[PDB]
Design a protein around this ligand. Structure first.
Ligand SMILES: CC(C)NC[C@H](O)COc1cccc2[nH]c3ccccc3c12
Lengths: 162, 286
């Protein structure tokens, strides 16, 4: 399912680390905070967790946080007036692809593509893919972009599992 | 492809069952029957133990890794697993080498075809084999001496869902030479001399049983097989040390798995011996 998708694309790390932006991140794609300070990240983390983690957390915990982030993700996608119509017209699969794009690029970032969303809502896949392939997101991470896009056109998990 | 993953699941399940079944058979036959108890079959017992640990501990998790296209067992068990793997292979080659040497010193002693070592010496030798094997496998792996310094390998190490073996050129070369090549050359030379001797005898006057020469042919078969299975793999290691990525990962994995499949060939090779055959058919209620 979707959890598997994200679990693959982003990846899962047991110990605190800095992401591609240099910000503090742990578990699957969970942002502790944006700051060079490890102490601020520790505060954020402990606030998200039950007790002091020192920066090390259990797989289970990581999954808990991932769930919180997915919840918050879905809520965000629903509240956004631009994204809402598109997400409602997409089947569970493409919905998952979308939730992926929102995990990586965030609400605003995803709302960045007007025509992509427009056609996704119009059930026109190929053209949409052609639009997403010329994007910045695709250029930055051509692998995840290619997989997600392929997921949009195919509407299947065949891109993440053979 | 779920259809593909199931097919592979069935194939590799048949593989694992074959390995476990066979080596278990060998060990049981060797341990139960007093007629089958000799230094040679003690070494064979060590070998079948190595291949057994290969069957239960390693192959299944590798299969799971390839099928699921990812590692679900966590870094800890990834590392320990690799340790188990290298340990097994090393112990195996060392065992075969020891066997070769034993046969050499046994054929050529004034009393011929007789091996000078009693039982408690053999056990000691095996124990030492496993000790130095785990010494050249676990230590380097548990001390993280193999680990590469590039960002890819580091990401794969810190990643719990990623199990991949990345080795700095140094570890690749050193470990592949010490754990494989040297004892290989040793075995080859020694056993070649053993065949030369066997031929210098068989043409000589009576009497020395042919069954023993057939046995030398059998052992020769075990060794030949092992070397032929693992050779392509250990060659490619040095290949990637010289020029890396000159060979596809898939191919690497393939040769790797050839080496794996080798672990189940021994039980079928021991059938050459009338003794092991009678024993086998005995345990099977035939
Ligand atoms: C798929 C992995 C985890 N298993 C690798 C090979 O089966 C055997 O590995 C070895 C056994 C003995 C000595 C060795 N030296 C090496 C150097 C590089 C890679 C593997 C080995 C190796």
């Amino acid at each position: 399912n979707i959890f598997e998708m994200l679990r693959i694309d982003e990846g899962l790390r047991l110990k605190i680390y800095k992401d591609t932006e240099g910000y503090y991140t742990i578990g699957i794609g969970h942002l502790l905070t944006k700051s060079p300070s490890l102490n601020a990240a520790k505060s954020e983390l402990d606030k998200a967790i039950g007790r002091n983690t020192n920066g090390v957390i259990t797989k289970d915990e990581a999954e808990k946080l991932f769930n919180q982030d997915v919840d918050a993700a879905v809520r965000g996608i629903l509240r956004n007036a631009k994204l809402k119509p598109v997400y409602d017209s997409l089947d569970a699969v493409r919905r998952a692809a979308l939730i992926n794009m929102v995990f990586q690029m965030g609400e605003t970032g995803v709302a960045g593509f007007t025509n992509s969303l427009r056609m996704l809502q119009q059930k026109r896949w190929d053209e949409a893919a052609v639009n997403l392939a010329k994007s910045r997101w695709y250029n930055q991470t051509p692998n995840r972009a290619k997989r997600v896009i392929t997921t949009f056109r195919t509407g299947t998990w065949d891109a993440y599992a053979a | 492809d779920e259809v593909w993953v199931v097919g592979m699941g069935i194939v590799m399940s048949l593989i694992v069952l074959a390995i476990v079944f066979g080596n278990v058979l060998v060990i049981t036959a060797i341990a139960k029957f007093e007629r089958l108890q000799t230094v040679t079959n003690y070494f064979i017992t060590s070998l079948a133990c190595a291949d057994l640990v290969m069957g239960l501990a390693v192959v299944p998790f590798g299969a799971a890794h390839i099928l699921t296209k990812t590692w679900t067992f966590g870094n800890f068990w990834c590392e320990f697993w690799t340790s188990i793997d290298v340990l097994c292979v090393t112990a195996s080659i060392e065992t075969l080498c020891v066997i070769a040497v034993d046969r050499y010193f046994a054929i050529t002693s004034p009393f011929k075809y007789q091996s000078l070592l009693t039982k408690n010496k053999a056990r000691v030798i095996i124990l030492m084999v496993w000790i130095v094997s785990g010494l050249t496998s676990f230590l380097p792996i548990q001390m993280h001496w193999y680990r590469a310094t590039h960002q890819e390998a580091i990401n794969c190490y810190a990643e719990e869902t990623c199990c991949d073996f990345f080795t700095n050129q140094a570890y690749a070369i050193a470990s592949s030479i010490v754990s494989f090549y040297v004892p290989l050359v040793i075995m080859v030379f020694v056993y070649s001399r053993v065949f030369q001797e066997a031929k210098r005898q068989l043409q000589k006057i009576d009497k020395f049983c042919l069954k023993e020469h057939k046995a030398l042919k059998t052992l020769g078969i075990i060794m030949g097989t092992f070397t032929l299975c693992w050779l392509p793999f250990f060659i490619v290691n040095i290949v990637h040390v010289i020029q890396d990525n000159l060979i596809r990962k898939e191919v690497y994995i393939l040769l790797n798995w050839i080496g794996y499949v080798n672990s189940g060939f021994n039980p079928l090779i021991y059938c050459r011996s009338p003794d092991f055959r009678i024993a086998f058919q005995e345990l099977l209620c035939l």
